[PDB]
Amino acid sequence: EITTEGVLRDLMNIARVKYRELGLCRLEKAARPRASAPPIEVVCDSRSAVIERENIMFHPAMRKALFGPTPSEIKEASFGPRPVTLYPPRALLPAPDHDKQRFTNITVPSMARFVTDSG
Amino acid sequence: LIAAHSHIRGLGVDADTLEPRPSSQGLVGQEKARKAAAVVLEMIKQGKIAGRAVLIAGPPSTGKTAIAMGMAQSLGQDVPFTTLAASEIFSLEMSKTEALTQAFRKSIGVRIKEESEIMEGEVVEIQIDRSVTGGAKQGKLTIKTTDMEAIYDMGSKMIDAMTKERVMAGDIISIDKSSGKITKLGRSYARSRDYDAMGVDTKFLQCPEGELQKRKEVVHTVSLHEIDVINSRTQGFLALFSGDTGEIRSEIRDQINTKVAEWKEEGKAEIVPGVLFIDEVHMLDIECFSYINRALESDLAPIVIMASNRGVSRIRGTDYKSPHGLPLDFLDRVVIINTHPYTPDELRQILSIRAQEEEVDLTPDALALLTKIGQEAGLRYASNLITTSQLIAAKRRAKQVGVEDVQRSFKLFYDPARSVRFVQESEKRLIGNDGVVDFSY
Amino acid sequence: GLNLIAAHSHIRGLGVDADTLEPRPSSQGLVGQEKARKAAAVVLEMIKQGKIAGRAVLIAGPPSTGKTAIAMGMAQSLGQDVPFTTLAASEIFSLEMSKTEALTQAFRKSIGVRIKEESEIMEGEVVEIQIDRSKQGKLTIKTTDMEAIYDMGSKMIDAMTKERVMAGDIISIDKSSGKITKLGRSYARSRDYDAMGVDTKFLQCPEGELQKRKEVVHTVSLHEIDVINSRTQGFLALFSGDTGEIRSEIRDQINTKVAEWKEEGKAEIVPGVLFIDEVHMLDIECFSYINRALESDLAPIVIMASNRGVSRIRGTDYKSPHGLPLDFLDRVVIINTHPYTPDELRQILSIRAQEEEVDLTPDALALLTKIGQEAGLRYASNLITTSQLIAAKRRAKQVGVEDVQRSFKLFYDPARSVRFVQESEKRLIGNDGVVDFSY
Amino acid sequence: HRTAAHTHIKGLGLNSSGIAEKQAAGFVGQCAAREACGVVVDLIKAHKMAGRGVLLAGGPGTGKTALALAISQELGTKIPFCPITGSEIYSTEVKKTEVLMENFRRAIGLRVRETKDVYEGEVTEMTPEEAENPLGGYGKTISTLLIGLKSARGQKKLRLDPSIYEAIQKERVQVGDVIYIETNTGACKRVGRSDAYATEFDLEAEEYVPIPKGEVHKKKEIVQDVTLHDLDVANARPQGGQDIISMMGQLMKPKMTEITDKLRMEINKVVQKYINQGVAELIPGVLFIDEAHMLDIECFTYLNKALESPIAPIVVLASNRGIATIRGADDLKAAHGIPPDFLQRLLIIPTHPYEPDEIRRIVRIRAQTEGVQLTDAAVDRVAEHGVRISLRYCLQLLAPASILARVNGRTQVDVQDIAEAEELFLDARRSANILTSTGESGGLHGFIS
Amino acid sequence: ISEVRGNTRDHRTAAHTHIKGLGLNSSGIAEKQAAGFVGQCAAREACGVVVDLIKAHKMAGRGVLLAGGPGTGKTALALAISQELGTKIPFCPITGSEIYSTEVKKTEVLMENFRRAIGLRVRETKDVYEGEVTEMTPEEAENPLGGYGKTISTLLIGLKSARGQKKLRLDPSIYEAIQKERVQVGDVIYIETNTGACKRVGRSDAYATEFDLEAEEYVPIPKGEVHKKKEIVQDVTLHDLDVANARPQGGQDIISMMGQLMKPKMTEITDKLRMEINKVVQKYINQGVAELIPGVLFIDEAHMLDIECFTYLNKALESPIAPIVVLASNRGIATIRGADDLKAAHGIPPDFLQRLLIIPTHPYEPDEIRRIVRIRAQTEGVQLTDAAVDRVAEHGVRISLRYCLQLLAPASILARVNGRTQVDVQDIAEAEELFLDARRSANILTSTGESGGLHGFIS
Numbered sequence A: 001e002i003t004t005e006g007v008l009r010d011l012m013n014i015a016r017v018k019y020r021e022l023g024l025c026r027l028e029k030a031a032r033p034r035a036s037a038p039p040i041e042v043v044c045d046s047r048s049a050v051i052e053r054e055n056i057m058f059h060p061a062m063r064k065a066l067f068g069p070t071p072s073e074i075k076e077a078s079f080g081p082r083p084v085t086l087y088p089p090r091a092l093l094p095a096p097d098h099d100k101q102r103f104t105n106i107t108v109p110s111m112a113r114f115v116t117d118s119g
Numbered sequence B: 001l002i003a004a005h006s007h008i009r010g011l012g013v014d015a016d017t018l019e020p021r022p023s024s025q026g027l028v029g030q031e032k033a034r035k036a037a038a039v040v041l042e043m044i045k046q047g048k049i050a051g052r053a054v055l056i057a058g059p060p061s062t063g064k065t066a067i068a069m070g071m072a073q074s075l076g077q078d079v080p081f082t083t084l085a086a087s088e089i090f091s092l093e094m095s096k097t098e099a100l101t102q103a104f105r106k107s108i109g110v111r112i113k114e115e116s117e118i119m120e121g122e123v124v125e126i127q128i129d130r131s132v133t134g135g136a137k138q139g140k141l142t143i144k145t146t147d148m149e150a151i152y153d154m155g156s157k158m159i160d161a162m163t164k165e166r167v168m169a170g171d172i173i174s175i176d177k178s179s180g181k182i183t184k185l186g187r188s189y190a191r192s193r194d195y196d197a198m199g200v201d202t203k204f205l206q207c208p209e210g211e212l213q214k215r216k217e218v219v220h221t222v223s224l225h226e227i228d229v230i231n232s233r234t235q236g237f238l239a240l241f242s243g244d245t246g247e248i249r250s251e252i253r254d255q256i257n258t259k260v261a262e263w264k265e266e267g268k269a270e271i272v273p274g275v276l277f278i279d280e281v282h283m284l285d286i287e288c289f290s291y292i293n294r295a296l297e298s299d300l301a302p303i304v305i306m307a308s309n310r311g312v313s314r315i316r317g318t319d320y321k322s323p324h325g326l327p328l329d330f331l332d333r334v335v336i337i338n339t340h341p342y343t344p345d346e347l348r349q350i351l352s353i354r355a356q357e358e359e360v361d362l363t364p365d366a367l368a369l370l371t372k373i374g375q376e377a378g379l380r381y382a383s384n385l386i387t388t389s390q391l392i393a394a395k396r397r398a399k400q401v402g403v404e405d406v407q408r409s410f411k412l413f414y415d416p417a418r419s420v421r422f423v424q425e426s427e428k429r430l431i432g433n434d435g436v437v438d439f440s441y
Numbered sequence C: 001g002l003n004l005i006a007a008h009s010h011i012r013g014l015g016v017d018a019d020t021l022e023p024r025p026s027s028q029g030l031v032g033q034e035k036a037r038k039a040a041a042v043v044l045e046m047i048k049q050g051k052i053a054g055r056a057v058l059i060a061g062p063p064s065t066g067k068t069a070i071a072m073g074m075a076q077s078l079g080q081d082v083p084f085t086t087l088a089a090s091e092i093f094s095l096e097m098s099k100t101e102a103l104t105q106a107f108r109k110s111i112g113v114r115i116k117e118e119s120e121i122m123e124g125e126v127v128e129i130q131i132d133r134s135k136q137g138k139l140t141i142k143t144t145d146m147e148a149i150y151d152m153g154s155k156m157i158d159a160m161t162k163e164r165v166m167a168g169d170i171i172s173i174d175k176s177s178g179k180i181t182k183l184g185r186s187y188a189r190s191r192d193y194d195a196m197g198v199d200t201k202f203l204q205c206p207e208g209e210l211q212k213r214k215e216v217v218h219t220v221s222l223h224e225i226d227v228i229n230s231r232t233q234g235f236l237a238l239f240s241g242d243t244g245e246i247r248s249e250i251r252d253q254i255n256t257k258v259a260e261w262k263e264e265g266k267a268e269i270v271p272g273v274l275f276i277d278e279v280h281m282l283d284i285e286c287f288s289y290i291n292r293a294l295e296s297d298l299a300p301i302v303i304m305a306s307n308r309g310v311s312r313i314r315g316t317d318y319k320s321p322h323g324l325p326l327d328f329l330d331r332v333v334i335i336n337t338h339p340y341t342p343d344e345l346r347q348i349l350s351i352r353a354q355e356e357e358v359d360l361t362p363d364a365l366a367l368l369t370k371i372g373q374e375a376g377l378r379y380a381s382n383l384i385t386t387s388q389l390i391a392a393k394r395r396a397k398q399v400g401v402e403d404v405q406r407s408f409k410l411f412y413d414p415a416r417s418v419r420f421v422q423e424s425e426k427r428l429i430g431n432d433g434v435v436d437f438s439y
Numbered sequence D: 001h002r003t004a005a006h007t008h009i010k011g012l013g014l015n016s017s018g019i020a021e022k023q024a025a026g027f028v029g030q031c032a033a034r035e036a037c038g039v040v041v042d043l044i045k046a047h048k049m050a051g052r053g054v055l056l057a058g059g060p061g062t063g064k065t066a067l068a069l070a071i072s073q074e075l076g077t078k079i080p081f082c083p084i085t086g087s088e089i090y091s092t093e094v095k096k097t098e099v100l101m102e103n104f105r106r107a108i109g110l111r112v113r114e115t116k117d118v119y120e121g122e123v124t125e126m127t128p129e130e131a132e133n134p135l136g137g138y139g140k141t142i143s144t145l146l147i148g149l150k151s152a153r154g155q156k157k158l159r160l161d162p163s164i165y166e167a168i169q170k171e172r173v174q175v176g177d178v179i180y181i182e183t184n185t186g187a188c189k190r191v192g193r194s195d196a197y198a199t200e201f202d203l204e205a206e207e208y209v210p211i212p213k214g215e216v217h218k219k220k221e222i223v224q225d226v227t228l229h230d231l232d233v234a235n236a237r238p239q240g241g242q243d244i245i246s247m248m249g250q251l252m253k254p255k256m257t258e259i260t261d262k263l264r265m266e267i268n269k270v271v272q273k274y275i276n277q278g279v280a281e282l283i284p285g286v287l288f289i290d291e292a293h294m295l296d297i298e299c300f301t302y303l304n305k306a307l308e309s310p311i312a313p314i315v316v317l318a319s320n321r322g323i324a325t326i327r328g329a330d331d332l333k334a335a336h337g338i339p340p341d342f343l344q345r346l347l348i349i350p351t352h353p354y355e356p357d358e359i360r361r362i363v364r365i366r367a368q369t370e371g372v373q374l375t376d377a378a379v380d381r382v383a384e385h386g387v388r389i390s391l392r393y394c395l396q397l398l399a400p401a402s403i404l405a406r407v408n409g410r411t412q413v414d415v416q417d418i419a420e421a422e423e424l425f426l427d428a429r430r431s432a433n434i435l436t437s438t439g440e441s442g443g444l445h446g447f448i449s
Numbered sequence E: 001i002s003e004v005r006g007n008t009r010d011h012r013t014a015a016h017t018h019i020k021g022l023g024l025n026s027s028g029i030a031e032k033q034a035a036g037f038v039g040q041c042a043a044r045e046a047c048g049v050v051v052d053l054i055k056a057h058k059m060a061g062r063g064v065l066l067a068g069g070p071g072t073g074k075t076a077l078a079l080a081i082s083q084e085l086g087t088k089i090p091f092c093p094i095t096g097s098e099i100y101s102t103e104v105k106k107t108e109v110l111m112e113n114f115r116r117a118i119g120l121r122v123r124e125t126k127d128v129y130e131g132e133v134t135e136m137t138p139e140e141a142e143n144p145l146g147g148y149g150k151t152i153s154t155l156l157i158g159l160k161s162a163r164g165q166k167k168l169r170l171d172p173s174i175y176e177a178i179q180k181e182r183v184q185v186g187d188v189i190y191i192e193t194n195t196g197a198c199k200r201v202g203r204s205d206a207y208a209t210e211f212d213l214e215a216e217e218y219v220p221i222p223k224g225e226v227h228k229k230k231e232i233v234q235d236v237t238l239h240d241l242d243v244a245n246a247r248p249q250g251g252q253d254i255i256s257m258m259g260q261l262m263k264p265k266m267t268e269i270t271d272k273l274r275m276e277i278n279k280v281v282q283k284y285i286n287q288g289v290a291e292l293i294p295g296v297l298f299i300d301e302a303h304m305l306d307i308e309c310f311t312y313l314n315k316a317l318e319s320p321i322a323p324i325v326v327l328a329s330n331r332g333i334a335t336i337r338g339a340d341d342l343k344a345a346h347g348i349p350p351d352f353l354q355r356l357l358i359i360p361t362h363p364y365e366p367d368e369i370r371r372i373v374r375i376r377a378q379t380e381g382v383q384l385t386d387a388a389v390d391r392v393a394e395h396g397v398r399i400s401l402r403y404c405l406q407l408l409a410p411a412s413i414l415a416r417v418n419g420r421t422q423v424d425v426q427d428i429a430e431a432e433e434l435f436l437d438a439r440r441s442a443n444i445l446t447s448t449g450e451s452g453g454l455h456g457f458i459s
């Protein structure tokens, strides 16, 4: 990490450099799942069951870790007289491998298709 | 480094008539096999034919790998040339069938064409705003040619790249807007002196000229297997390199086959069929062969080149023997190319080529003796003695490998036939197939 | 307690005159086997000196001839000064990992690294905390015997806040780390609350001085340092298992660093024993690994036991003595144990009767010794506890002959059981599955 | 363009009376088998029966795979044709009977009409509102997002649920972006920058897109083709929600699992409701198990359960074997390599070896299909190899001989070019003779046995 | 803190501790007794050429077989090769047993070890400023920006090492690192010139008494120069590059962090990665900034490899960047482990055997055994009477070399517990009776195990 010519640094980065050079981050998806579903749920006619669904299936601390600090936390951390730490220091959700498709299977039409799909 | 087939630099055939030259491009003899291989190169280069299985057969040595490696050297860089040792198909990560499916699809290329815009210019100013205690970032780049200057907005990804690259005023940089790659190329003037720790001094460059933007066509070739991996996942494209793919579901591959046909008709992609070379194929089992029977029938099948040393031999996973070690309903799909044992005049030529490739200066007497050894002990053994004799000759500071050095090499290192005699002569002191041995004198 | 009376609980050492290694006929629980015990005592001297690496010793002999007893006696008389890993050969056949990996672990468990350390640690009950949120603050803390006020740096106040320290908590501060630990609450605070959280524990208050400092000796095996370095919190795998096949470049780097710690005197290396019990259950692939593993500068001494005659080697189909490859036996010296005479049986049965706290009559011990001669040592040993339970049903104070006799008729020895099987041929399920359920 | 082994097969070549034309749709002969395969096609198009089995029985090269491919072409692209070899059943991730069920359910189609209920617009304003959680330990959370969407026709302000804001956060939306929000999933897609900001002066290649036409809120009707296997898998490893399980399911390595019969019977009830609602129609299709002799006694035993299922597909088996040992049942031998027990369930279509004139006619069809011109002497010479050696062998010579011809500058293949192809490219039996003749020699130049 | 052990730091001894090299003249001819070897002069001369082959760096993927009975010095010769080459050359020893991983296919295990045996040496310059922070001081700018409360043109940092003090006039952007790393005066940091950022090592132990309690460790002041610019040499195997690419280590996200907390299973790495690594490695070699160091893969008990391993080694050895592979075998005519009806010499498939340079190791004469006994005795530090040397050598001839060598340590103990520092015949005669050899133990199995019903061996 620290040497002025990064020979061993670049040698340790070949796989991800090659991946991006091939454009596989930007090439359109050639497949997706034909069907998609949300998780199965227990149906139980109690209020405790509904509370538990929110606690586990929409788990606040995991979500807060993935998506990071709220805007007031950023203000309260930045304007204070002394520094303060945040529950996660950052959003811990990874960067998506695909630059345009990201975390969804939604696809959008384009002019390339529009020109070529009429002969 | 020098390796076993480093001298092989083509197939050694006339491109017009396909006539094999008796020596050319490092290949010697085997003319019928080399002509048959030259015809298979035309089938590959034309690409119109799918799934022809060719078996190179012959006894050990005789150049079955050498011919297949000559073909790889003749196809060049654009065409896929997957090599499998058949033993690679047995896996814990995936079934044998999946391992074959991946190797077939590794052998089909997809040559995508992209148009991209690159910026290139002298950085006149750079400005970055950073939030305290947070991720929020914004910035502006002022960049110049001898003929343009403009101010570009920067996003967070650019600001990360700009600081990773330590972009500073006076730097010459180029930015691929499609990939987002930034590279520096030099500086318009010296690195400013007031600050310490400012890093190594760059190349000098004059300022770029003309327009800041220019368009550039760029071409990428990827396998169908690489497309399979990317599309079976939201995340984890590191599986392209790590293995680690699992058994990819067949409805994903159905979609990719359809979309690649659509990309071809749309003119987005050119499909480039290559070859799967399976080496020592008799290591596959009866389930592998039953799969390959029908994997060959796709219009996306590569041409499959095979090698076998085997006689009539037992098929793996099977009670019974078959020619080449291969089952008959498989061999019904296969044309066979036969390689033959060498003449002494061919051995002399091959050994001369190995000596030249290894940069070893044989005396004519050493070459004659090595040729005689080649007849009696085999081509591989005589080629090993070349390197050995060179070392021994150098230790005695001789200019050339003499018969003295070849004889000492032959004395020090046993050939297989002489090693088998040594084993027979010491059956009591070596451990038997039933584990008995005597350690006493 | 948890240590109930087991089959080897009477073995308390090797029973040799340590200045001369001559075995005393019956001492420390071991009876007889003097030639094997003297050989075992010479092996202890190799172990205790530690200079010899990777000797393999096989203890061979019929069943119930003290092969386990002698290896346990070595463990007892080597003492906790030195590692003594006991491996049944069946344990090498892991699903979590390779056979050779499982052996590489068992070898490295048997080499200690010993470090001597001064740790300075403050432990006490918190009296109060004060903070100047103008950062700085003060901690007041007590033992039973001492009390003090300490100036806290800002990071200590942050850590005290994040770890939610409050009055009546017992805390420790490691001065080297600068890291807190809430140990619990004092029993004096048990009256603070009508309901307690699940995680709360009461303690006695710390005692003596606050800032204790102690000379501590630490002995850690090479395998522990492997598992620690295998992954970021690898010390958890020391308990759950879960190591995987630890990559060899980790072990090479650990071996290099431990060699530096010895060279610098920071640590000493304490080579110990791996005992592979019933080693004939290993296969040809295992033995081929052990050949190379013994030939290493950090190899333990390996001891192993077998009761096999000429027997098939596992992973092949030829036979060999002890069930072991001749290529492997060429690396091994062999200690042979023997059957026992009636006077040695009489003593072992007496040692067992004392350990099981059973009062045998002299005639009971005589009969029980004849049974041990006719039916084997383990069977007669099992009749001691059996006869005590039968005597107790008579409310008898001592085990009489009739209690041994009733134990004998109720519980069959192996030979009498094999006869019963042969006389019941058609009512038991044979090796071809045939049986007749009819009368 | 690329030509494979079966590229000449176009269909079964039957009359409207169901009788085979002697040469049609790429076939020559097999007329009785083509007529039986025609009745199989009509069994499938009737979509009334579940779990009927067919065996294509006959020697290697007798067109069993051609016939199965012809069925797939007679059925057309609406009906699921699911082709596998028996070697594909041996998964390392899941038990062999799981991949049988997956392939059974890939063979059953569904066409379903779907309403996407959706929001679109340029993002005009975007404002989060916050919850001051006292003792959760994770700090604050965001209680809703207010977002303003503008289209060409109108505008709305949406107070989004937190889980829909998390979808917008994943999509990296900013003010002035054009976005799409599918309320079915709660998924968000960023379409681009609004064309109101279209400028060259951003370093990153943004998609500048026009303002969405029509209303901000829309309902789209889409017709979707799915199989039962797609539904099974979607509900086994869920990825469609904005819940935490769905979220992490998109990050973990893809993995097949031994989907329970409880999930399959539940999805039958789901599909039955789509059918009763009239939004779906069932399209039962076929599973073709090529190389079915590579199955094993556990697979065949499992088919005895699976074919009883009241929505099982039609299963076509090909086998090429005489009396042979059943795999995994090494004491049991039977015809076709199929257990006698399971053979009672099948209708067997035998296929037969070709006559010399049929072989000659196939050579012409195949030469025309590969696009190569032969003399009649050449066609006769190739047909002789088809008779004397094998149909497959003689068809493999056409492409080599065409190159060898072109190499001499002649555009039409004649007997000299086949005479060279015969010598460069041996068959299995001439190669087996070289093996057998040489194998008397040991030492260096022997073949390894 | 830690209590240093002062008294003794002597070596242990193992089966090959006496082997110090191949014991060859400058002419390469073997000396009859040298570097701990006795005899094997032809095999040592052949291994001497193998050392010169490896050390010449010309050739890739040549195979060598050490062939000979058990105890004939084959692993001694391999260990001698490793010592002749020295630790700069990679040496990867395995048995053929070690290839049967549960995590990956055995050909991946073989290819991992194959690329462990290939070293790469990379030379780079390291360029950093280091010290405890003595001072931090902004400079206001002469042209302050409008609407901003302060404009800073420079940020001065004083760095002190054990060897000097320097005022670093840094670019103002380093405020970012100072805030994020929370750099105080008295903290030990470095600044790297390839980024211009800084990182915090800790607080200097010069300040360890600022408070009665603070929650941080204290670190010594750097004992180098305040400015460290020097060349550094990095040695990595190509397997290290495989793993560094296939299992990237530094990832900041939840999935990376869960990853590094779980069992780090190896994976069946692709030929596409290894080929792309090879092609970039070859770029830097052609630039001269890296140099390749082909080493030795030594496979002990190579007869434990099966035919799938050998057919893979065919492909592996043909690749241009490959080690020298040395195999050792003792299995006569034997069945190939994976092909239950093929028997061949050495247990090596004949197809593969043709590739190998074969070196035979022969048995030992009685006088060679006696010389080895004395070399082994002086290595284990045992002192013997000459009659004891003879009696031990008699067991070496009659029974086995290994057996007679192994009696020396028991006999040494038996001597000193009689007060004698020199081992004599009386001690050998007791060691040989406490510690049986294989053959005498097998005679007991034959004699006492004549029946099994009770007091007999299990058979």
Ligand SMILES: Nc1ncnc2c1ncn2[C@@H]1O[C@H](COP(=O)(O)OP(=O)(O)O)[C@@H](O)[C@H]1O
Pocket (backbone or CB within 6 Å): B004, B005, B006, B008, B026, B027, B028, B029, B030, B059, B060, B061, B062, B063, B064, B065, B066, B067, B350, B353, B379, B380
């Ligand atoms: N005809 C040939 N011309 C040049 N080199 C050859 C020829 N035949 C064999 N060789 C060389 O001799 C060695 C053995 O041949 P190889 O191709 O490995 O045989 P196999 O058919 O067993 O794979 C290789 O190094 C190869 O380069």
Ligand SMILES: Nc1ncnc2c1ncn2[C@@H]1O[C@H](COP(=O)(O)OP(=O)(O)O)[C@@H](O)[C@H]1O
Pocket (backbone or CB within 6 Å): C007, C008, C011, C029, C030, C031, C032, C033, C062, C063, C064, C065, C066, C067, C068, C069, C070, C307, C348, C351, C377, C378, C381
């Ligand atoms: N020499 C001995 N002295 C005391 N107890 C013994 C002796 N030999 C065996 N025993 C006891 O008899 C039982 C069988 O002996 P053990 O060593 O376990 O059998 P094995 O020889 O099969 O390993 C054990 O309870 C053991 O403690």
Ligand SMILES: Nc1ncnc2c1ncn2[C@@H]1O[C@H](COP(=O)(O)OP(=O)(O)O)[C@@H](O)[C@H]1O
Pocket (backbone or CB within 6 Å): D005, D006, D007, D009, D026, D027, D028, D029, D030, D058, D059, D060, D061, D062, D063, D064, D065, D066, D067, D320, D362, D365, D391, D392
């Ligand atoms: N009746 C036919 N008409 C035309 N081509 C045929 C006919 N039968 C078989 N073929 C062709 O001959 C080859 C062998 O037939 P195939 O279906 O592969 O045999 P198998 O029964 O072994 O699957 C294929 O190329 C196929 O297209």
Ligand SMILES: Nc1ncnc2c1ncn2[C@@H]1O[C@H](COP(=O)(O)OP(=O)(O)O)[C@@H](O)[C@H]1O
Pocket (backbone or CB within 6 Å): E015, E016, E017, E019, E036, E037, E038, E039, E040, E068, E069, E070, E071, E072, E073, E074, E075, E076, E077, E372, E375, E401, E402
């Ligand atoms: N020529 C020799 N000189 C000195 N010691 C030797 C010699 N040959 C073998 N030894 C020693 O004798 C033992 C047997 O040799 P080893 O290399 O283990 O045999 P192998 O590897 O053939 O089984 C080892 O302890 C080794 O150090």
